[PDB]
Amino acid sequence: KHELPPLPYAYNALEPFIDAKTLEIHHTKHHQSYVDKLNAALEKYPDLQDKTVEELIKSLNELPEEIRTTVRNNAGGHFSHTLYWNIMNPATQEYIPEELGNALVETFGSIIAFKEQFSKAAANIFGSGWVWLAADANKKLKIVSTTGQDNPLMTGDAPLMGIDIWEHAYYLHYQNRRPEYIENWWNVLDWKAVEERYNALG
Amino acid sequence: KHELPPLPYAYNALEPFIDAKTLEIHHTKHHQSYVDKLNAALEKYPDLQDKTVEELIKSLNELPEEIRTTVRNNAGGHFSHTLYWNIMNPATQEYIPEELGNALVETFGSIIAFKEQFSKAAANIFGSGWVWLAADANKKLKIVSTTGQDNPLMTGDAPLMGIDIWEHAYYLHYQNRRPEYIENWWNVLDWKAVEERYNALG
Ligand SMILES: [Mn+2]
Ligand SMILES: [Mn+2]
């Protein structure tokens, strides 16, 4: 009963920053698999089908042991990819909303300093994982590195943006040149969507 | 002082099972990086510069905390890739030497049962990792799954063979179709090399 949403844009809409073939496989193979695996697990325990993926992630320890790992990885995967697609947009004029821009400046010193810290954390991921910008219960911002499809919901924070550092996110166009992928990704980040998330925390 | 070993074969020698471009990048970029990073980690510790990769892995808990993780990952990476190249060869008629064949049959029931259990473990890796055939001190065999560049040396076992399940190992030719890469990899496995290692355990 969870469904894979259509992308908010065509599979070739993030060219040349992300290649169409990748965006299509990433969505229709990798993300689809997380949804299908999550659904298979939840079909065994159908009262969980009524939970949001966020509720599942935040209550892993309460789920049946049989499916706990499958749910961590696949709800985590579903959540994380959903956010990734929704914070990207066909390459658009740089405009960082005031509230978010000011908070980044206050926290990291400048926008450039934030981008540098974030880029460096992403370049330093070992194996498969993610780098996030997250806000804690009091809206303080941090950069978080995670493994697998783990995400900041698990540590009680609100993810605002994340970059996928799994090799499938970049290998077809960039191969081992992960820094090139990271640098290019900034061109499709939708600051307005990141701002919407931050703003909602009120 | 740690050096990248040459491949025992041409970059196109495992075609069509492993693509030349992959073998070239996998070796000259990924494996090279593990060597360069291990060397960089050891630069400040001339006493450690004399240790084998194997000695480093077997002693990680005794290494300086400053470098421990980097040594685990990069010594592990150097060890793991060295073994991977050396247990592959241009595809030839499958001949499994008697001693190893017999041990596989005694342990798993049949060669095909072993190949099934091994392939299943490889298909089930979440994120970046390896699957190994390993022997204990008594030449008892087991299949081991690891994360990152971890390897059976770390649990006091002798790795005989391992398949790289990091996405960089297969994404250019197979993309998300990891099972296709796994199935194909059997065609380039050098059972003579695996048997050499097993035989050495005496
Ligand atoms: Mn992904
Ligand atoms: Mn590798």
Residue numbers in the entry:
A (entry chain A), B (entry chain B): 2 to 203
Task: Provide text from the study.
In the cambialistic SodFM2 from B. fragilis (b), all mutants displayed lower activity with Mn and the majority had higher activity with Fe, representing change towards its most likely ancestral Fe-preferring phenotype. c, For Fe-preferring CPR Wolfebacteria SodFM1 (CPR-His), mutations in both the XD-2 and water-coordinating H/Q residues were necessary to shift towards the inferred ancestral higher Mn activity. The structures in e and f were solved in this study. In some, such as CPR SodFM1 H/Q VD-2G, only a cumulative effect of the two mutations affected the metal-preference, whereas no significant effect was observed in either single or double mutants of nanoarchaeon Nanopusillus acidilobi SodFM4. Our characterization of these variants revealed multiple evolutionary pathways towards metal-preference switching. Importantly, consistent with previous reports, comparison of four protein crystal structures of the WT and mutant SodFMs we determined here indicated that metal-preference modulation by XD-2 and Q/H occurs without any significant changes to the secondary metal coordination sphere within the resolution limits of the solved structures. This provides further support for ‘redox tuning’ via subtle structural changes.
Only a few metalloenzymes have been rigorously demonstrated to be cambialistic in vivo, including some iron (Fe)- or manganese (Mn)-dependent superoxide dismutases (SODs; SodFMs); metalloenzymes that play an important role in cellular reactive oxygen species defence. To study this process, we leveraged the existence of naturally Fe-specific, Mn-specific and flexible Fe/Mn-cambialistic SodFM homologues, which differentially utilize these metals to catalyse the detoxification of superoxide. By combining phylogenetics, biochemistry and structural biology, we demonstrate that SodFM metal utilization can be evolutionarily fine tuned by sliding along a scale between perfect manganese and iron specificities.
